[PDB]
Design a protein around this ligand. Structure first.
Ligand SMILES: [Cl-]
Lengths: 97, 100
C-alpha cells in the first residue's frame, strides 16, 4: 500500500476553484479499482494550505491513477491556482495489510 | 473528520513490541463506530520511523477513542519503545464530508 501526502498552497482568491477541481479529482479517484484513500485536508492554521492523503494498493495503481482523465485534468486546472510547487511525502502502508 | 498524523521513532530492538502495540490499537480502533481511519505507515527510507494516520467523525469520537482499553494499553507501553518524543500534526478533514 503506497501512500502519499501532498501539500498544495492555493491563491486566496482561487480557493473556490481549487475546491471544485479537487471535488472532481476526489470523485474520480475514489472510484478507481486501485484507490484505497483519497482524503482532502486543510492545514489546521493556514487557510490556503491543503493536503491530499492518497493511498493506492501498490505503485502500479499509482501509475494507473496518473493516466486517468480526472487526474490529468486536475493537474492542468490546478497549475495556475497554486502559489508554488506541490510538496510530496511518500509513505509505505503497514496496516491495513 | 478530525484527522491527525503522528510520527514515532522506535528503538531498533523495540520495533516488534511497537508492532504488537499498534496491531492491538489498530484492531480495536477500526471496531470503534466513530473511527474513520487508522492507518499505520512507515517511512520510505528510515527503518525505525513510523506514522499513524487517524481520523474520527468528531471530537466526541476522539474522546471515546482515548477511553478505550486498546488506546490505554498503547499509551502505557509506548514510552519504553521510543527514542525521543512523538510529533503530532492535526488536520481539518474536508473530504469525505459536506464539501464533497
Ligand atoms: Cl530495556
Amino acid at each position: 500500500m503506497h501512500v502519499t501526502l501532498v501539500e498544495i498552497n492555493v491563491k486566496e482568491d482561487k480557493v473556490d476553484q481549487f475546491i471544485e477541481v479537487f471535488r472532481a479529482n476526489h470523485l474520480g479517484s475514489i472510484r478507481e479499482a486501485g484507490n484505497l484513500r483519497f482524503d482532502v485536508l486543510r492545514d489546521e492554521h493556514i487557510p490556503t494550505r491543503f493536503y491530499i492523503y492518497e493511498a493506492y494498493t501498490d505503485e502500479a495503481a499509482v501509475a494507473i491513477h496518473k493516466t486517468t482523465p480526472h487526474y490529468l485534468q486536475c493537474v492542468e486546472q490546478l497549475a495556475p491556482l497554486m502559489t508554488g510547487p506541490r510538496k510530496k511525502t511518500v509513505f509505505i502502508g503497514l496496516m491495513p495489510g
